[PDB]
């Protein structure tokens, strides 16, 4: 039973208190298989090598730092800080014009049993959540 | 909760028998009913005959006294539980007249969705598949939870997630998400349309 | 024999009649393994969880709706409408200047046997097909 | 033991002599499993179908060809030229303003035993290497 | 369709034997031939000797009457089918003189591509590998289908896909896609070059 | 290379026994030592007693002559190899006084990281986990390779990769990457700050 998961954007996704993006796990397209979920984080059951990914839909009515960071982060008892795994820097944007930009990344990382993975967009304000088919976060063992 | 469909015959008469199963004394507001030629529009309001229960096996019996051409069609045993909110969809069986007559019931009908070799009756709009139809068993249908919807006769195992109208894009819910309709986004109090994605506003400014 | 496939942009890709993007299956880099193809759609043989993906090369000589939708859609007998799975909104573009923008997405979705998946770019006119190594659509079971 | 690998940007990545991008294999997030590495190239041990991918972080202080090519290429004894597999064309950029753009692609390609895969960004000057969590190249068998 | 290479010896003479297999009575327009020191440029026009067939095992025999230094080189048994369009590439074997002489045939030659332990003769430009060379068997080569091409001596199992010149970028096919050359894109009737990607126009305006 | 911790008792006395394993005649510059109440700050400089070796099983013995309250605490057997450059972290065991006393050693201590059911002593800053602590065995720690670092008491199996300061962004290494600190980026000779990402310059112009 190969560990797999796909989590979707929700109404509580944007804590915006320096908290990582939260995700839906059961409703519609969301699912977990051999992976737990705790406070915005995929939680590894079976240790090993996982292809991890995340898309985030970005946009707005014009521009408020143009540099915007979207990344995947390891939490672990093996280190007191978060560990950057896969990270992108965009800069898509007067404020008279509306704009949209998707930001996808994925990659194979090694995860020990109990180690967590979270998504962080650096200016949460710019995250646009419509129906959750626009922004997601998941993984599968390889 | 079980549903069955059987058709016993005695001389000139022909009995159609919807059989229903439910927890004793939770049947108050429970209805079993039969439908002739209802394209998943089957309800007590559109039934031939019904039995609203009052308080573990229940039964509905519709007897056809004479074999005639106009009684030919497609019948469906259906149940509805008030306390549960659960619907129940029995298999699509057919009467066909020729002189003679025969009962009957891979290219499943519009109202059905395929499950392995078998076909299964679809659930109502705003109703999710709780249990797949067995060979003898019928389709079980739970209502969508809040924040979800299904807008069609469906065989979906999970309800579609309602669209959120983003305040920060100057949008608000023009129509609210009912369990049979998605929400729709128009512009906020004192905002106007910048661009449109379809026949709806994508983003609004004040 | 783990179901896998990778399909490439073709001369018939842009039906542009509200039809989904069509793909090549046998020529060059294109292939099918334990997956059928019918009228622009990957067709599932073995039911289960598939990582699905699509890249589309976009560009042109300037700009004609700047908002442009690139998505992956489920067809099924279990619902009369198409079901959005994974979708992006871009806005890359006077018309004096030439521009290019790639749009990639992927994600793990559950697919029942006989269920279809298609790609749709909302303004097909902006799809720039060169050798088919620019635009593609495929999947593999996870 | 399913072949997998993830390689990260390094100080020698930008040879910039018409050479392909070089990668780190052992340090930090980098790893090889059932795949060899030779002169900027993943080297197949076990022949078959691989999902391959690459992200590159791009940016700079303004603009010097705006069209920029990021692609995955097959080397093989079966053909004297390199073979394009998966390729994107971007155009993200006065020079007064700083900008960032990530370029991700992935796809399933068939690779015979001993066949190589490399990454090429067409103007290496635009590749911005920070900690190697910004730019990477890897694969896994499907 | 099979190909073999054998070299029988009798006193002073030395026979080289190309052996070919084909469906009886589909050999009209069929040619088996031998090549000395042809770097995959081997053809009837560049053969030492050939046998054009007319109508299941066929044979070509080239006898070397005397062992001499100038007969030393690298030989190849090759067959061409007209009806099929299929080429056939036998293994690269060598004659080497010293006084004495020896016949012969992991660092495969330029004209070969590795397959497991063995090496295999490459297919002609515009020719795809239909079948890998066996230990005794030779490389089989199908011609590229239309809309595809291979521009080199190759061991590719599938032909490269021809590039489409995008009308909407004001481009047209300067050169059409032959089975040995990719197509090339220049500007449309009454259009000019905006930017160039190499020594070709990327996009054109009118 | 093995590490063990045993505590033998005889009348009034109590012996603590660090046991170390090493290749014969590669022990020159080798140190085994014991630490009372060191929060992973355990070193020869902060040891109770040590044994610097000179030249396969080695041993350190610290005897407590009398059972007293002030001898109560948390002890750790540690070893340091000069030639290998490897640290060695034995399990955290405890003496507790009450009258009486007891020796001892899922909510692992700050200095530990969990591995299955067990807890393991963390490695020093600039030291990677070479081998996980066994039930009897201790944590083995390799130093970070060049171009990498770890800036904390850690249980990481691989060192963090040092940040490169991009010349093309007008940046240079303000601080160089030590094995215990990441590198830091300031502006190049004759360049100034454009924007800041934290308390460091993101990009510089001249
Ligand atoms: C969609 O549903 C929401 C509720 O989930 C609707 O917003 C609600 O509308 C009601 C009725 O107008 C509001 O009632 C109000 O109560 C205040 C007292 O606080 C009273 O002074 C007003 O006269 C009014 O009756 C209610 O406040 C509001 N709910 C919330 C939480 O704000 C919404 O109108 C629906 N949308 C559409 C377009 O139907
Ligand atoms: C590449 O191949 C295409 C065909 O696949 C070439 O276009 C074709 O060119 C021929 C020869 O000029 C055209 O023939 C014409 O027929 C009309 C009658 O309708 C006649 O009046 C003209 O005098 C001319 O002979 C043919 O129409 C055209 N094919 C199509 C479908 O339009 C193309 O020219 C080739 N490109 C190059 C640069 O060689
Ligand atoms: C971080 O480490 C690097 C070395 O990896 C430091 O750059 C090096 O600095 C030394 C000491 O200033 C340079 O030595 C010089 O040698 C020349 C002779 O060629 C002499 O004329 C100078 O007086 C000077 O002593 C050395 O050249 C240089 N290394 C290289 C390869 O250029 C760097 O300074 C360190 N950064 C910081 C901020 O500490
Ligand atoms: C549908 O449900 C009813 C009630 O649950 C079934 O009758 C039961 O069947 C089980 C298993 O055969 C028996 O253990 C019970 O004794 C029955 N319960 C009662 C109270 O009679 C019935 O068999 C089902 N019908 C079909 C066609 O599946
Ligand atoms: C190449 O092909 C020929 C013709 O197909 C082979 O001869 C046949 O071999 C099969 C299997 O050994 C026999 O069943 C047939 O009787 C043969 N056919 C005829 C008509 O003779 C030949 O063995 C092959 N040569 C090599 C070296 O593989
Ligand atoms: C730690 O290491 C020492 C030395 O390697 C171990 O003693 C050896 O144990 C192996 C396996 O039991 C024996 O084959 C050897 O004979 C021993 N070597 C010598 C030279 O004595 C010791 O058992 C280990 N201790 C623990 C607690 O794991």
Residue numbers in the entry:
A (entry chain B), C (entry chain A), D (entry chain C): 92 to 155, 159 to 187, 192 to 240
B (entry chain D), E (entry chain F), F (entry chain E): 27 to 81, 91 to 133, 136 to 142, 1040 to 1140
Sentences reproduced from the published study:
HVEM is a TNF (tumor necrosis factor) receptor contributing to a broad range of immune functions involving diverse cell types.
The asymmetric unit contains three copies of each hHVEM, hLIGHT, and hCD160, forming a ternary complex with 3:3:3 stoichiometry. Within the ternary assembly, hHVEM and hLIGHT exhibit the classical 3:3 TNF–TNFR assembly, with contacts that are very similar to the structure of the hHVEM–hLIGHT binary complex described above. Notably, the structures of hHVEM–hLIGHT–hCD160 and hHVEM–hCD160 complexes relied on the use of a single chain hCD160–hHVEM fusion protein, as the relatively weak interaction of hCD160–hHVEM (7.1 ± 0.9 µM) does not support the stable complex formation in solution. The crystal structure of the hHVEM–hLIGHT–hCD160 complex provides direct evidence that hLIGHT and hCD160 can simultaneously engage hHVEM, resulting in a higher-order assembly with the potential of coordinated signaling through both hHVEM and hCD160. The recognition interfaces in the ternary hHVEM–hLIGHT–hCD160 complex are similar to those in the binary hHVEM–hCD160 and hHVEM–hLIGHT complexes, suggesting that little molecular accommodation is required for HVEM to simultaneously engage two types of binding partners. Because both hCD160 and hBTLA bind to similar epitopes on hHVEM CRD1, it is likely that hHVEM, hLIGHT, and hBTLA are able to form a ternary complex similar to the trimolecular complex of hHVEM–hLIGHT–hCD160 we have determined.
